């Protein structure tokens, strides 16, 4: 009767309008604090992200076979009991199982029969008494775990994760203020492509990062770091292409930062940096230079060397003037320059054809140069500037610009 | 039963009616004098600012996890008791938090367990008896707190605040008529970017500020200085961008502040200024100034050196004409000359087309010129010129001004 009434309150026609889309453009169904998991949910045939959040003590019925598109099973805080044919369906079919949880009963005991798993994030604290990682000792059974995002506050990297690491590639360890004592356990892990020690309170970069030769994406966010002197040992890594250094307390940069020519997305933002050396521009592959909310007094001119640079974001700095050779770059896609103390934009910004979004809300612009209307791909929406400063443009020039905006 | 009744009675349509927009264009819900908190409030996902004011018997249900845009929750005079899954959701979703209370009675306990928030605004008397900064001893675990406004009529700076501040960025101090005992304890805490002091009745600016080299915005409103021999000592600090000394009693401003070209904002309105010498105005790049309701007989000549203005004021004083020195300036956008005795209006001030908002109502002008007729930029909603002589102004002038009130 509970299941029938559950289908009655939330019919297939009722949840048909409830059908929403996620970031990955997959159909999702956010089921939240619902008394049971409904069969009208299952009558759908293209749901890919079954969003099971906080559904207490419910048996998943055989009707889940109707979800032909079900790749990602998002089990959040849900006590989920399931039958034997559907266990077999899990060992042969399911490819992604994204689990948020708090309890080892909330995480289910029937996902270690699962074998076809290829993607999973765990979210929720796992430090517990007498029951640590015997939950996921079936990671050894999970022979295809490449994506393991961990917003789970692990105090130390599991060794079963290491034995998995033959195929593990992405480890986003958001420990939330807990240090990951790697103790060169990642030295055994010679096959990683990515490592993200996010908010792990390092203050010192471990050597297990440098000792590898396959890492491509390193993200050291919010580590309270002071010096980056160790990148001379980064020349062993021949595939490093991105360093997102978000939200740190770095007082100054050395010059040897110019050595990593392989770097493309070098972030150095939200820091206390007072001097950028010219040597830094020895790198040639730099593509995403996000220097937002910094203490930079001026953009260096030698930044014109970066011919691959696409998204250069230098918002909320103390940048006074823009030098000419800064505008030697033509591949710039997103120039976020707002909240600065800039007095004017040089006319070379009119040379930019790829100009799509230029943030000029702030600065000290007396009048906008007319060449800003020359940019064809730039519409009025992309022109982020104060209206009082914007209104200097000519009438028919404004007509052409509004024609571009409405097109 | 009352909580349940408030749940069903508050429909989603009436609730969508109650959603307004705040300053940040963010959707705000003002929950005013509700006996409980409707679950339909948490049903509507468009909410961002949840203002719940003087709502008793509050048990915030975790259905608020289904609400998507919640970054503000405005707890006013409320004994809040949140649930643990809601604790988990707001640890990753909420980003700002204002709290109003009456001592320990309406201070909630779940606020400390949330450790990812940015803004923690506290309202109400924290200077209670027998609890001298011992309730806030649990703030040490917060490492992500960067904005902390303290308006609780504090007697002394809490030592726990000194311990916590190491990761702070924004701090505001409001005492509303109480002499704070700072006792020069700010030398420890170096990361601070914005510091404010409003109506402290000090007259003696402390010394611990100079050990900090990161303060950009300093607000000293209503501090009633009379001889600022501190701006010769403010030369030690080379980070302050805008000084805010308005509604003071400055007899004369000492000349040394003329040496800081980075100063961009001179808020000095409603003062007891008799004469202010020249060398104050050696700084060229000052945008916003306010000098309303004074006793100045002539605006000093070296304001003519100021070439980057945006706003001034000659409200309610004994100045009859605009000097040619002010005409050496070229950037007079806004002013405040209302209810004053200005007689002569030359063509130099009148040709300033970018005149943004000048108060002129009640001014004792003789006649108003026909230069307010044609141009579509300088018009009434911009310039509120004297309406006694706006009647004798030509009807085409009135056409431009009423065009302002329409366009």
Is B88 close to A124, i.e. CB distance below 8 A?
Answer: yes
Which residues of chain B make contact with A388, given a CB cutoff of 8 A? 356
CA distances from B48 to B6, B67, B100, B143, B205 (A): 21, 9, 19, 24, 39
Radius of gyration of chain B (CA): 26
What is the C-alpha separation between A245 and A221, in angstroms, rounded? 5
State which residue of chain A sits closest to B115, comparing Cα positions.
Answer: A176
Candidates B68, B217, B332, B354: best to mutate against A (most CBs of A within 10 A) is B354
Q: Which residue of B has its CA nearest to A33?
A: B63
Residue A375, class by beta-carbon neighbours within 10 Å (0-12 exposed, 13-18 middle, 19+ buried)?
buried
Residue B14 maps to a domain: yes
Contact in structure between A238 and A215 (CB atoms under 8 Å): no
Chain A residue with minimum CA distance to B377: A391
C-alpha distances (whole Å) from A305 to each of A283, A300, A320 are: 8, 11, 21
Residues in chain A: 407
Q: Answer for the pair B71, B94: CB distance below 8 angstroms, yes or no.
A: yes
CB contact under 8 A, B65 and A32: yes
- What whole-number distance in Å separates Cα of residue A336 and Cα of residue A329? 15
**What is the CATH number for B114?**
3.80.10.10
Q: Do A77 and B85 touch (CB under 8 A)?
A: yes
The phi and psi torsions of B45 (rounded to 5 degrees) equal -80, -10
For A21, B54, B78, B80, B124, the CA distances from B105, given in Å and listed in that order, are: 44, 13, 9, 10, 11
**Please, which residues bridge with residue B151 across strands?**
B123
At B38, is the secondary structure helix, strand, or coil? coil
DSSP three-state, residue B239? coil
In a mutational test of the B interface, the residue from A17, A18, A33, A273 whose CB has the highest number of chain B CBs within 10 Å is A33
List the A334-335 sheet strands across, edge first: A334-335, A357-359, A383-384
Residue of A nearest to B68 (CA): A30
Positions of E strands within B44-100: 49-53, 72-76, 96-100
Q: Which chain B residues are within 8 Å of A56, Cβ to Cβ?
A: none
Q: Which residue of B has its CA nearest to A124?
A: B88
> From the CB of residue B195, how many other CB atoms can be counted at a distance below 10 Å?
20
Secondary structure in 3-state letters for chain A: CHHHHHHHHCCHHHHHHHCEECCCCCEEEEEECCCCCCHHHHCCCCCCEEEEECCCCEEECHHHHHCCCCCEEEEECCCEEECHHHHHHHHHCCCEEEEECCCCCCCCCCCCCCCCCCEEEEECCCCCCCCCCCCCHHHCCCCCCCEEEEECCCCCCCHHHHHHCCCCCEEEEECCCCCCCCCCCCCCCCCCCEEEEECCCCCCCCHHHHCCCCCCEEECCCCCCCCCHHHHHHHHCCCCCEEECCCCCCCCCCCHHHHCCCCCEEECCCCCCCCCCHHHHHCCCCCCCECCCCCCCCCCHHHHHCCCCCCCECCCCCCCCCCCHHHHCCCCCEEECCCCCCCCCCHHHHHCCCCCEEECCCCCCCCCCHHHHCCCCCCCCCEECCHHHHCCCCHHHHHHHHHHHCC
Best CA proximity match to A109, nearest among A130, A127, A131, A92: A131
Which residues of A sit within 8 Å Cβ distance of B? 30, 32-33, 53-54, 77, 102, 124, 176-177, 249, 272, 341, 364, 388, 391
The C-alpha atoms of residue A296 and residue A310 are separated, in whole angstroms, by 20
Torsion of Cα atoms, A86 then A88 then A92 then A97, to 10°: 50
Q: What is the DSSP letter of B258?
A: G
Q: Tell me if A146 sits within 8 A of A169, measured CB to CB.
A: yes
Contacts of A77 in chain B (CB under 8 A): 85
What's the structural domain count of chain B?
Answer: 1
**Dihedral angle, C-alpha A23, A28, A29, A32, nearest 10 °:** -40
Q: How many CB atoms lie within 10 A of CB A24?
A: 10
**Yes or no, beta carbons of A364 and B308 under 8 Å apart:** yes
Q: Please report residues of A whose CB lies closer than 8 A to that of B191.
A: 249
Q: Which two tokens stand for residue B377?
A: 């930029």
Instruction: Examine residue B106 and state whether it is found in any structural domain, yes or no.
Output: yes
Q: In this structure, what token pair is assigned to residue B392?
A: 């004798």
Is residue B167 classed as helix, strand or coil in its secondary structure? helix
Contacting residues of B for A364, CB less than 8 Å apart: 308
Beta carbons of A37 and A58 less than 8 angstroms apart: yes
Going from the C-alpha of B155 to that of each of B51, B232, B314, B343, the distances in angstroms are 29, 29, 38, 50
State how far residue A271 is from chain B, nearest Cα, in angstroms. 11
Residues facing residue A79 across a β-bridge: none
Closest by CA to B287, choosing from B237, B343, B354, B230, is: B354
Cβ neighbourhood burial of A18 (10 Å; 0-12, 13-18, 19+):
exposed
Q: CA B61, B65, B69, B73 torsion: positive or negative?
A: positive
Contact assignment for B115 to A177 by CB distance below 8 Å: yes
Is residue B37 included in any domain, yes or no?
yes
Cα–Cα dist B350/B332, whole Å: 10
Q: Quote the CA–CA distance of A84 and A62 in Å, as a whole number.
A: 10
Q: Which residue has the tokens 């004053």?
A: B340
Within-domain flag for B140: no
DSSP state, B160?
H
CB of B173 closer than 8 Å to CB of B198: yes
> By the 8 A CB rule, do B341 and B364 touch?
yes
Q: Which of A263, A149, A159, A231 is nearest to A198 (CA)?
A: A149
Whether B289 is in a domain gets the answer no
> Structure tokens of A82?
């399931």
Q: What is the dihedral of CA A171, A26, A264, A274, to 10 degrees?
A: -80
Instruction: Tell me the C-alpha distance between B276 and B228, whole Å.
Output: 12
CA–CA gap between residue A55 and residue A277 (Å, rounded): 56
In this complex, do B63 and A32 lie within 8 Å of one another by their Cβ atoms?
A: yes
Q: Please, which residues have CB within 8 angstroms of residue A375's CB and are 6 or more apart in sequence?
A: A350, A352, A353, A355
Q: Which two tokens stand for residue B75?
A: 């707890």
SS3 of B148, please?
strand
Of the candidates B234, B229, B285, the one whose C-alpha atom is nearest the C-alpha of residue B252 is B229
> Does the beta-carbon distance from A33 to B143 stay under 8 Å?
no
Q: Is residue B20 part of a domain?
A: yes
- The alpha carbon of residue B387 and the mean position of all alpha carbons in its chain are separated, in whole angstroms, by 31
Nearest CA to A260 out of A288, A231, A289 is that of A231
What is the distance between the alpha carbons of residues B354 and B357, in angstroms, rounded to a whole number? Answer: 9
* Residue B375 CB partners (closer than 8 Å, separation 6+): B353, B400
Q: How far is CA B19 from CA B48, B51, B398, in A?
A: 10, 11, 39
Residue B169 three-state SS: coil
Report the side by side order of strands in the sheet with A49-53: A20-21, A27-32, A49-53, A72-76, A96-100, A119-123, A147-151, A170-174, A194-198, A217-219, A242-244, A265-267
Most A CBs within 10 Å: which of B39, B83, B88, B240, as the mutation test of the A interface? B88
With contact defined as beta carbons under 8 Å apart, do A111 and A134 qualify?
no
Residues making up chain B, counted from first to last: 407
What phi, psi does A181 have (nearest 5°)? -80, 90
Beta bridge partners of B74: B51, B98
> With the C-alpha atoms ordered A184, A189, A190, A191, is the resulting torsion angle positive or negative?
negative
CA angle in degrees (0–180, nearest 5) for B122-B126-B129: 170
Q: Which two tokens stand for residue A150?
A: 């961990």
Q: Say whether A33 and B115 touch across the interface (CB within 8 A).
A: no
Report residue A398 CA to chain centroid gap.
Answer: 38
Six token digits for residue B197:
């002091």
Secondary structure class of B380 (helix, strand, coil): coil
Q: For the stretch B355-380, what's the b/e string if a residue is b when 16 or more beta carbons lie within 10 angstroms of its beta carbon?
A: bbebbbeebebeebbeebeeeeebbb
Q: Nearest 5°: phi and psi at B12?
A: -75, -30
CB contact set of B70 (below 8 Å; sequence gap of 6+) = B47, B48, B50, B64, B90, B93, B94
Q: Give the number of other CB atoms < 10 A from CB of residue A12.
A: 14
d(CA A212, CA B51): 51
Instruction: State the Rg of chain A over Cα.
Output: 26
Is position B25 within any domain?
yes
Question: CB atoms < 10 A from the CB of B30, how many?
Answer: 14
Q: What are phi and psi of A65, to 5 degrees?
A: -65, -20
CA B153 – CA B175 distance, rounded (Å): 5
DSSP B399: H
Q: What's the domain range around B6?
A: 1-124
Asked whether the CA dihedral A273, A277, A278, A282 is positive or negative, the reply is negative
Beta-carbon contacts below 8 Å between A and B: 24
Nearest to B191, CA basis, from B239, B141, B158: B239
Instruction: Answer positive or negative: Cα dihedral of B42, B46, B50, B51.
Output: negative
Closest CA to B54 of B72, B76, B79: B76
Phi, psi torsion values for A183, nearest 5 degrees: 50, 50
Return d(Cα B394, Cα B406) in angstroms, integer: 18
Contacts of B63 in chain A (CB under 8 A): 32-33
Nearest CA in chain B to A320: B262
Best mutation target among B83, B85, B87 (most A Cβ atoms within 10 Å) is B85
Residues of A in contact with B88 (CB under 8 A): 102, 124
Provide the token pair at B19.
């959603």
How many whole angstroms separate alpha carbon B206 and alpha carbon B189?
A: 15
Contact assessment for residue B319 and residue B293, using Cβ atoms and an 8 Å cutoff: no
d(CA A37, CA A317): 51
Contact: B63, A177; criterion CB under 8 Å:
no
User: Could you tell me the resolution of this structure in angstroms?
Assistant: 4.1
Query: With an 8 Å Cβ cutoff, are B308 and A249 in contact?
Result: no
What is d(CA B226, CA B296) in angstroms, rounded to the nearest whole number? 15
What does the block give as tokens for B299?
């605006």
Let me know: does B145 contact B167? Beta carbons within 8 Å. Answer: yes
Residue A356 class from Cβ within 10 Å (0-12 exposed, 13-18 middle, 19+ buried)? middle
Q: Which residues of chain A lie closer than 8 angstroms to B93, CB-CB?
A: none
Alpha carbon of A395: minimum distance to chain B alpha carbons (Å): 12
Instruction: Label residue A222 left, alpha or beta by phi (over 0 means left) and psi (-120 to 50 means alpha).
Output: left
Q: What is the DSSP letter of B78?
A: -
Report how far residue A186's alpha carbon sits from residue A194's, in angstroms, rounded to the nearest whole number. Answer: 12
Beta carbons of B137 and B165 less than 8 angstroms apart: no
Closest CB to A177 among B88, B143, B191: B143
* Cβ–Cβ below 8 Å for A102 and B88: yes
Question: Quick one: three-class SS letters along B275-328?
Answer: CCCCHHHHCCCCCEEECCCCCCCCCCHHHHHCCCCCECCCCCCCCCECCHHHHH
Q: Which residues of B touch A (CB under 8 A)?
A: 62-63, 65-66, 85, 88, 115-116, 143, 191, 214, 241, 308, 356, 377
The answer to the question of residue B104 being in a domain is yes
Residue A348 main-chain phi, psi, to 5 deg:
-65, -15
């Amino acid at each position: 009767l509970r299941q029938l009434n559950l289908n009655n309150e939330w019919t297939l026609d009722k949840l048909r309008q409830r059908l929403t889309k996620n970031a990955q453009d997959k159909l999702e169904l956010h089921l939240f604090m619902l008394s049971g998991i409904p069969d009208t949910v299952f009558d759908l045939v293209e749901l890919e992200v079954l969003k099971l959040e906080l559904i207490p003590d419910v048996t998943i019925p055989p009707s889940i076979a109707q979800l032909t598109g079900l790749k990602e099973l998002w089990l959040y805080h849900t006590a989920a009991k399931i039958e034997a044919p559907a266990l077999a369906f899990l060992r042969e079919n399911l490819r992604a199982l994204h689990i948020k949880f708090t309890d080892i009963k909330e995480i289910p005991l029937w996902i270690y029969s699962l074998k076809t798993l290829e993607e999973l994030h765990l979210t929720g604290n796992l430090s517990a008494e007498n029951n640590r990682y015997i939950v996921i000792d079936g990671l050894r059974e999970l022979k295809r775990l490449k994506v393991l995002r961990l917003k789970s506050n692990l105090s130390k990297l599991p060794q079963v994760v290491t034995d998995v690491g033959v195929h593990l590639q992405k480890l986003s360890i958001n420990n939330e203020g807990t240090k990951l004592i790697v103790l060169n356990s990642l030295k055994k892990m010679v096959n990683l492509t990515e490592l993200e020690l996010i908010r792990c309170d390092l203050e010192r970069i471990p050597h297990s990062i440098f000792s590898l030769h396959n890492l491509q994406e390193i993200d050291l966010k919010d580590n309270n770091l002071k010096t980056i002197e160790e990148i001379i040992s980064f020349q062993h890594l021949h595939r490093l292409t991105c360093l997102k250094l978000w939200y740190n307390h770095i007082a100054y940069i050395p010059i040897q930062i110019g050595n990593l020519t392989n770097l493309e997305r070098l972030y150095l933002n939200r820091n206390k940096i007072e001097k950028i050396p010219t040597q830094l521009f020895y790198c040639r592959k730099l593509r995403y230079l996000d220097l937002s909310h910094n203490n930079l007094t001026f953009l260096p001119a030698d930044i014109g060397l970066l011919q691959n640079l696409q998204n250069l974001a230098v918002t909320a700095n103390r940048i006074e003037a823009l030098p000419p050779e800064l505008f030697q770059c033509r591949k710039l896609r997103a120039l976020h320059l707002g909240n600065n103390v800039l007095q004017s934009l040089p006319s070379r910004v009119g040379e930019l054809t790829n100009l799509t979004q230029i943030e000029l809300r702030g600065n000290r612009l007396e009048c906008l140069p007319v060449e800003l209307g020359e940019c064809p791909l730039l519409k009025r929406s992309g022109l982020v500037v104060e209206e009082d400063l914007f209104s200097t443009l000519p009438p028919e020039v404004k007509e052409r610009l509004w024609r571009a905006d409405k097109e």
